[PDB]
Structures are given as structure tokens and as C-alpha cells.
Amino acid sequence: ENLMQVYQQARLSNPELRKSAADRDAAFEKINEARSPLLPQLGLGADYTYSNGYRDANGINSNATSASLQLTQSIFDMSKWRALTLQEKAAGIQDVTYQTDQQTLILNTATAYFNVLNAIDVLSYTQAQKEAIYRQLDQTTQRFNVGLVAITDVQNARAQYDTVLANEVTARNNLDNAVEQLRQITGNYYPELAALNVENFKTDKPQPVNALLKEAEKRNLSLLQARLSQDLAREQIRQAQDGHLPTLDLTASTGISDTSYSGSKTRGAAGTQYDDSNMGQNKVGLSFSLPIYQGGMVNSQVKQAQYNFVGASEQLESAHRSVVQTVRSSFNNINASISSINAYKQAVVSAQSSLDAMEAGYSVGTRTIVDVLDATTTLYNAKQELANARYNYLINQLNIKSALGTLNEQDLLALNNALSKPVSTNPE
Amino acid sequence: ENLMQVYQQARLSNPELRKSAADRDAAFEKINEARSPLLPQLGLGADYTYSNGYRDANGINSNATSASLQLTQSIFDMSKWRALTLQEKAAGIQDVTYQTDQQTLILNTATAYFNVLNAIDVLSYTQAQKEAIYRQLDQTTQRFNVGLVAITDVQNARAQYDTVLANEVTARNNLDNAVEQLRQITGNYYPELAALNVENFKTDKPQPVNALLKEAEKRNLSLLQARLSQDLAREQIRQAQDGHLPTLDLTASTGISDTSYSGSKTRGAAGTQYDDSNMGQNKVGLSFSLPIYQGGMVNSQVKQAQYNFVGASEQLESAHRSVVQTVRSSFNNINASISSINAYKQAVVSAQSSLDAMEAGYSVGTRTIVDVLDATTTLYNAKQELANARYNYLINQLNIKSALGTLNEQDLLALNNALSKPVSTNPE
Amino acid sequence: ENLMQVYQQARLSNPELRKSAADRDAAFEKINEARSPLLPQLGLGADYTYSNGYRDANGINSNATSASLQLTQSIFDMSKWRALTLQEKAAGIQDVTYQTDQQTLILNTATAYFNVLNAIDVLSYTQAQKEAIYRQLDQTTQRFNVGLVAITDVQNARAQYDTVLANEVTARNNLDNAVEQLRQITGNYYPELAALNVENFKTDKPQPVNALLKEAEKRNLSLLQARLSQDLAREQIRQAQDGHLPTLDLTASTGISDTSYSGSKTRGAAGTQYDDSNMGQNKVGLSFSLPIYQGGMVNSQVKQAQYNFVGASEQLESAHRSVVQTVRSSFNNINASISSINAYKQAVVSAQSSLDAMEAGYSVGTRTIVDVLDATTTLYNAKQELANARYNYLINQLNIKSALGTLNEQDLLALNNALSKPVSTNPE
Structure with missing residues (x-):
């Protein structure tokens, strides 16, 4: 599909x-x-x-039986409030990753697809090779059958053929694994998938890394994820800075207290005192707590969180150049990818007319047919190689689109659009 | 050995x-x-x-002189019970993790094993390569000695040779390397291991993936480790579900209260009250603690675990298709692996007579001996490549067994079966 | 620079x-x-x-009006003391981890460094490749212009060429790439670095592994980091051993108790008791707390740490053989690395006259110039490969130093010594 x-x-x-x-x-x-x-x-x-x-x-003894309800509110204690924003930033940060994840699957989504295609492609190529090498070895047999060759001549192509199986075999295997890669991500055995439409695929010179780099810099998610992470620990700076803060908390409870004295000294005059332990009480108010000196614990911690923030501060840079380097990285990849196609594209033509070189060379019976198959094999190679590049350039787009973070399901359609006719994965 | x-x-x-x-x-x-x-x-x-x-x-003053004994028990809390089953699962998973290392260790031991053979293997090859490539270079100078070559032939030929030297040493390096690979896991210098015996070696057709996949699904431990991982998360939600219940616990204490008052308000007629009096007391019973409102914390906790399980729930599917993948991963490998040997095995045959072609051609002297060295060395490469695939199939064998989970110290034995006569690693 | x-x-x-x-x-x-x-x-x-x-x-009613000051001290608890040494070790390990990054950073700085040279290096090569491969394609058309070729020669030749273009750009890409590699760690656009000087460059025989291995064993920091890691776990068991001891701690409090009764049972003759009293009090002393039975928790805790240490105890051995491995890892590398240069160094010589063979053959015109371009470019490849191994040996040098732990900013200097005259990365 x-x-x-x-x-x-x-x-x-x-x-x-x-x-x-x-x-x-x-x-x-x-x-x-x-x-x-x-x-x-x-x-x-x-x-x-x-x-x-x-x-x-x-x-002096008693049964102490009691029932009490209790509620307390956190009067003074911003660290929770701090910690609040913390998970707030956690959420924002954790939010970040998922955003990454979309593209990730997005990214990987295209990958295995065209990979299947590549395997679809290889699966196409190698067979023709086997379609040839079999022939070559085939008539070599009949050269030995004609005795026009020796057994090494006989033998070499034999294995030379079987190596083809040694190819095609793995190919289809790759074919299947191409499936599973996608079924893994997707979850379905996909008989066919859209091939790459050649006439509607334009090689597209990408954008200047200068802007895009700054573009993803507002964008790139890990770099995004770090920035908030840098933002995150930033509060951690101020969470342990909320140890400095005193606390005040709502103190509210109620309930019944029910006692009965027992044993010897329960026995006495009772003085309007000795009686059945039964009552209930209400305690409402606050609890304020100001840490004064803990031994620098809150002190040392701050630096801890503080020096954390540094390495946290580090990670932005450690991330930024990366995302930076990531930027041109993909950038230089696509362009190189641009170059390859134009090479192999030429290459395909090479084999193309080269492939023709067989036919009009064969139809005149000058050069054999197996050779045509040979060259016939060859053309598909670029058609392998070319196709692979044709996927890569598309590949790098998402990686760029990925690294940019600009990657979206629109960056996907542009892939899907050039996807025009499907091909099955079915090895035959 | x-x-x-x-x-x-x-x-x-x-x-x-x-x-x-x-x-x-x-x-x-x-x-x-x-x-x-x-x-x-x-x-x-x-x-x-x-x-x-x-x-x-x-x-109002006294010496506070006090001590007591205290025991405590949990009467009703399920979370502890939750905690109880939790580590049970943790052990449940952890227990699972262990076996993983058997096949792990199992996989490696075989894994690094044949690398010795390889390192042994290739080393056998490259040595003859020098024997071949040197004599060539050896004769080449003889030409330059006869002038039959120029130095360009010579330098390159010499250069041609030296690369051989470059090649071989690495092997011995790898020789030790492959050796140390084993010593790493194993830890003992090993002179010789029993290599593969072409007599016993049998390429063998496996079971249906559809059958295999299910089997490992009962077997493959990471996947097993996965389900418990999921199964593990099962509790946690239920753990997070255990903030609901009240907690009843056994409350018991005993100890002496020894009171000596002091100061002005200790002094007086004492009112038949004030006076260094010293006691000890017992408090025993239950602690019933019923949470009412934490702010839905328990509630939001659950969903946490809830999703937490589901994201874990992914892993099953996540790992399952993957383990499904792995199922189709090597099952292909081995088969393609099979194709490997069949090619090189022929290919060996290809070189085989190829060697023989040489010797006769040299025996009759129609050709040089260098070729035989060339081919003779050449033969090893297949025989070299041969051993690899011979191992790789064997190698993939266990991996399947691992992936299957079928892997065991019996599967080791299967490998242990085709190994006939050991040979040292010592480079001569 | x-x-x-x-x-x-x-x-x-x-x-x-x-x-x-x-x-x-x-x-x-x-x-x-x-x-x-x-x-x-x-x-x-x-x-x-x-x-x-x-x-x-x-x-029975009053305003509860109360405040107090509180200080607290630990008199006898060793676990705190345990805690004391613990982070000491944690720092002990953490401290160790730091140096790791020196060699780490140290390793990289050299590491990414020569890649610039490489990227510089290869780029030098591939450029001449185009110079060679283009002129070929250049002349090839001249044949098709003379008809001396067909287009098949041409397209492939053109195709043959274009791949060159495909090849080169990546270099420049890698050029920047290798550049950014440095900027990543470093962060500054670098025009030119001093490359290796074939004059100073000396292949150099190392010490005995048996000697080296021991040395790093005093040195290699991960292994060091390992022992402390083990050493770290040493405490923990002893930490887990510290649940045994009772805990004595300094108990001190002061503050005002201000009591105003209220309500009906506050009203009355007061019995020389009920009234708006208000006080403040002091409580100072020790907290002795002796655990008796936690359920062997402390006990089972220990074994946890106990095994915990041992599983860690593995790491020593685990890392030791590995560090032992690493000891034999690169020590081989460098040597085989040595063999590398000796081959290509000859190989350069091989191409060297090979070039010279061309020029004369072209000088006399017995041969074309394209070949010289071919060979001339060819020469670079060795000269290209040359620089690599030249670096790789140098590269392995530090790695050993890292693996040895001997690596330092002096070892940087050793690399820094053979670098004579920088050259830019700017592709022309």
C-alpha cells in the first residue's frame, strides 16, 4: 500500500x-x-x-479506643509548588520526546517501506542475475558438454551460479525481513507496496543549512527536549532552593476518644476524674516550619542541583552542536545523495545503452544472449543502485525533516505521492 | 579443547x-x-x-529518664501484600533475566568459539597466501634479476607482498583476539579447540516459522521477560490501586518511664504528686489507617501505572512482533546461511579442482608453481569461507535456539558434536 | 591549527x-x-x-498558641558514618569517572583530529581522482568525437566519471563532517590543522603486554573505576551491616507554650488551675535507638548488598579480563597497525614509482597522460591510506594510553609532535 x-x-x-x-x-x-x-x-x-x-x-491502665478524622493543607511550601512546575517541565520535556517519537516512527515509517522496496528492488535484480548466471553456467556445461571448456570452467560457473542462489536466497530472505521490518512497525504482512514513480520524482536541491539549522533550533525536538530539560533542572535549581523556605501547613482533624480505666488504680475515689474514657476533640489550625540550619544540606544540595544545571547547561551545548552537526550532517548527506543518483542515474543510462549494446549486438548474433543477460543483469544493478539512492534522497529528507523537526506527515505524503504504483513482496 | x-x-x-x-x-x-x-x-x-x-x-523541671521496647506488625495493608507480589514478579522477571544469560553465555561460548576456528581458519589461509604471494614476489625479483620485470612490477610486487604480511599479522592478532574473545568469557589460555568436522557437519532444514515462532513465544525469554515485564506492570496498577485501602497494623510497646522532677516547681509539698517517680508501661494493639482524600493522588497514581502498564503493554506487542521478527530474523539467516555453504561448498569444489588444475598444469610444468601457491592458497579461501558459513549456520543454529528460547547446553552439545579434532592457535 | x-x-x-x-x-x-x-x-x-x-x-477549649526552637544531632549512628564513607566512595568512583573523560576528551580530540586530516587527506585524493577520471572521460568523448568509442564507453565513462563526483562531494561533506567532529567537542570553525609529518613520524615498538597490562591495572580508570565500584559495594554490605547498631542522637528543643483556655469547662473557679497561662520550655538530650527485630530486614538487606557486592565483584574480574582484553585489544591493534603502514608505506612506494613509471612513459609519450592522472591520483590513495594508518597507529597510540590509563595531555603532545605544517579544510 x-x-x-x-x-x-x-x-x-x-x-x-x-x-x-x-x-x-x-x-x-x-x-x-x-x-x-x-x-x-x-x-x-x-x-x-x-x-x-x-x-x-x-x-493505672485503660482501654484506649479512638476514632478521628484528619486533614492538613500545605500552608507554606513552594517546593511542592516548585516541584509542581518541575513535573510541569517534566511534562513539557516528556511532551517533547513524544513529538520526537512521531517523527521517529515517521522516519522509520518511510525507512523500512522503501527498504522493502529496495529488497523489492534487489529481489527484482538478483533474479535477473540468476536468470543470467544460470544461463552462463548453463552453456558452459554444454561447452564441457562440447568439451569447449574444462571442468574448472565447468566447476567455477557452477558455484558461480550457486553463489547467485547464495545471492537470490538471501535477497528474498531480505525480502521477507523487509516485510517484518514494516509489519513490526505496522503489524501487517503487506503483499504489495507502492513503487517509486520515476517521471514524477524531481531531484530537489534542499535549503541552506544556515536557516534550517536555525529553523530546527526553534524546532529540533531532542535539542528541544534538552532545552526544556535545561529549563527543567532550572527549577531544580529552585526546588532545593525551596529547602531554604520555611513551611506552613493547615492542621485540621477531629474524632472521638473513648477510654475506660481498668485494673487496680482504676479503683479509687476518682475525684470526679476516674471514669469511662469517652470523648472526642477538634484541632484546627496551621503548622509552620522554617528550617534554620540543617548543616548545609540544603546548601550543598543547591550546588548539587546547581552543578547539575551546569552539566544540564552543558547538555544544551553538547546537544546544540550535535543538533548543529546533526543539521549539516543530514544536509551534506542529501546533497551527496543528490550526487550519487546523478551518477548512477547516468550509470543506469550507461547500462541502459550498454544493455542495448547487447540486444542490437545480439539481434545481429554478434555477442551471445547470456552476455545480454549479463548486461541485462547489469542494468538492473543501477536500477538497484539508483533505486537505493532514489530512496536515500527521500530518506535524507525525513532525516533532515526529522533533524529539523519540520518532519511531519506532510513530509510523509511527498514520499507517498511519488509512490504511484505498488509492487508486492511476494517472491516467485 | x-x-x-x-x-x-x-x-x-x-x-x-x-x-x-x-x-x-x-x-x-x-x-x-x-x-x-x-x-x-x-x-x-x-x-x-x-x-x-x-x-x-x-x-517546671525534671530529669527525663526513659527507655522502652517496641515491636510493630502490619495487620491490614494490601500494598505490602502488593509489595509482596511485586518483588515476586521482579524476581519473576529477574528470574527470567537469568536464563537469558544462559543462552547469552551459551550463545557467546559457541559464538566466540568458532571465531577461534575462524582466526585459526583464516590464519591457515593467509599463511599460504604469503607462501603463494611471497614466492611470486620471490620470483618477480628473479625477473628483475633477469630484467624480465622492471621495479614497478617489483615495488608493487614487493608492495603486493607486504600487504600480505599486513594481512596475516592481523589474523594472528585476531588469532589472539579470537582467543581472548574466548578467554574473556572463559578466562583461560586455550591452545587448541576442536574445529568443525566436514564429515559430521550437516546442513539441516528447520521447522516452520509459524511453528517455531509459537514455540519461542512459549520460550523466548526476553519475550517471556517481556510478558512478566508486562505481567510485572500488572501489579503496579493494582499496586497503585492499593492506596485505596485503609491500613491496620499491630501496635505494641513496653518500657520504663523514670521521672525525677527538678527545680522550684518540683519543690513544695508535692501535693502527693511531685516526686522522682519512675515507671514502665505497655501499649499493644492495632493501627487502622484508612486514607480518605489525598487529592486523588492514589487515583492519579493508578492511571500512571495504568498507562504505565499499557506502555509496557506495548512491549509485549512491541517485543512480540520483534520476537516475531527475530523468529523470522534468523530463520531466514540459517536458511540463507544454508545457501551460503552450498555456494562456497561448491565454491570450494570450484577452487578444489582449480587447485588440482594447477598442480597437474604445474606437475607437467605447463604452468608455474606460483599459481599452485596462488590456487593452493586460493583453495583455503573457500575452505576459509567454508569454515565460516559452516560455523555461521552452526552460529545461527543457537541464535535460533536463543531466539526460540530452545537454546540450551544441549544445543551447545549439537555444536559440540561436529567438532572432531582440535588444532592450536599458536602462529608458527 | x-x-x-x-x-x-x-x-x-x-x-x-x-x-x-x-x-x-x-x-x-x-x-x-x-x-x-x-x-x-x-x-x-x-x-x-x-x-x-x-x-x-x-x-474543654483553649487557644493553642505555641512555638518553639529545635536543634538535633546524631550521637551514635554508624550508618550515617556508613553514609559518610559511602558518598566518599561515590565521589571516589565519581572522582575516578572524571579522569576517564580526560582520556575520553583526550582520546576524542586526537580521535576526531586526524579525521580532519583524513577528510582533508581523502579530499586531496578524490580531487585528483576527478582530475584523472575526468580527463579520461574527457578524452573518451574525444574518441566518441573521433568515433573511437561508442557511447557505451561514453555513458559508462561519463557514468564512470560521475561516480567520482559522487565520491568527492561526500569527502567535502566529510570534510565539514570531520571538521564538525572537531567543532562538536571543540566548537570553533578550524581552517587548518597541522597534519602528520612523514619526517618525524616513527613507527614505534611498545612494551610487553604482560608489563603493559599490569601498568594499566594500576592505571586504567574504568578498571580503577571498577575496583572502587567494587570498593564502593564494599561499604554497602557494611552499610547493610549498619542496620544492626542502635542509634544515639542529640535531642534538643526550646520554645514557648502559650495556653489560653476557652469555653464552659474553661469557666469556673479555675481550681487555681484554669487560666490564660503561657510558658516556654527546653528539652535536651540524646536519642538512643536500638533496632531489635525488623524481621531480619537488616539481615536480608545485607545479603542483598552481599551478593550485590559479588555481582559487582564480577565486574572487577568482569572488567579485569576485559581490561585485560583491552590490554591485548589495542596492543595488537597498534602492532597490526604498524604492519598497516609498512604495507602501504611500501604500497605508497609501489604507487610511487608507479606514478614515476607513468610520467616517464608519458614523458616519452609511450603512454597517455590520463594514466599519470590515473596513477598520480593512484599515488594519493596509498598516500591517502598512508595518512590513515599513520594516524591509526597514532590513533591506537592514545587508545593504548587510554586503555593503559597512561593516556594524558602529554600523550596528546606525542601526537602534537609529528604534526608539522597545517593545511586547511576548505575545498577549492
């Missing part, structure tokens, strides 16, 4: 990405984990407690 | 594996950790306090 | 390294964290409570 359909099936059917999607979600969910702390704290304990003294305190 | 012991040796001597076995064993301890808390917690503590009022509460 | 500064530059400008230095520095802070707790913990807190009975305890 065409790449977009190839894609759409995969973009849903792709489990890796699909894992990203979830892995994306749990993040944004964690935001909830983030805020709930900013929520009041509601809960219920209960305890069955019996005090029994074994000493002078003996005889 | 023999791959079996060679395996068997490093099977023990393998630090990785041994690390694994322990590392596996390490986890299986952790299960204990999980259950531990569900035991009573018996503990003891001591505190020396002195309370001095600095205000109207001044003169 | 010069590798030294080139190194020296990125040695600072290297974000990775700099990350490391900080990252190293980051840990060394954490040591502070470890010691911090063993300091007194000075702290302050405030709570506003109001207690209202809703039952017979109703009318």
Missing part, C-alpha cells in the same frame, strides 16, 4: 510509538500527581490501645 | 553469567525484603531529656 | 568534559551532603491550634 496508508496503519499500529503515547500520557497524568499535594489532605485513622503498667504505674 | 568444556568452563568462569546468577540470586533475596515488613518489627530506643522552664513554666 | 591547542581548546570548550568536571564536582559536593546530617539540625516551627470538645469533653 501507499506510504501514507502504510503510515496511518502504522501510526496507530506502531507499538513503539504507541508506547510513547501512553508514556506521554502517564507524564501529563503525573501533573495530577504534581498538584494533588497542593490539595488538602483528607484521611481517617483508628487505634485500639490498652495501657497496662507493670510498675508503680501498674493498676 | 572441546566446546562443551569450553562452554562448561566459562559457564562457571563467566563473570557476566556468574554476575547474573548472583544478580538473579540478588533479586531472589529481595523477595525476602518484601515479606520482611509483613513480619513484626521488634525495636528498642533510649532518650535522655531534661525539661527546664525559662518562663512561668520555669521551675 | 595544532592538535595541542586544538585539544587544549576543546579541553576547555568541551561541553561533555566540562559537564564531567562539574558532574565530578557535582558529586564532590554530595560528600558534603553526607557529612551534613552528622551536623546538628537547627530548626523552627509554629502551630496555631484550637481544641473544642463536641462531647462531654465539650467546653
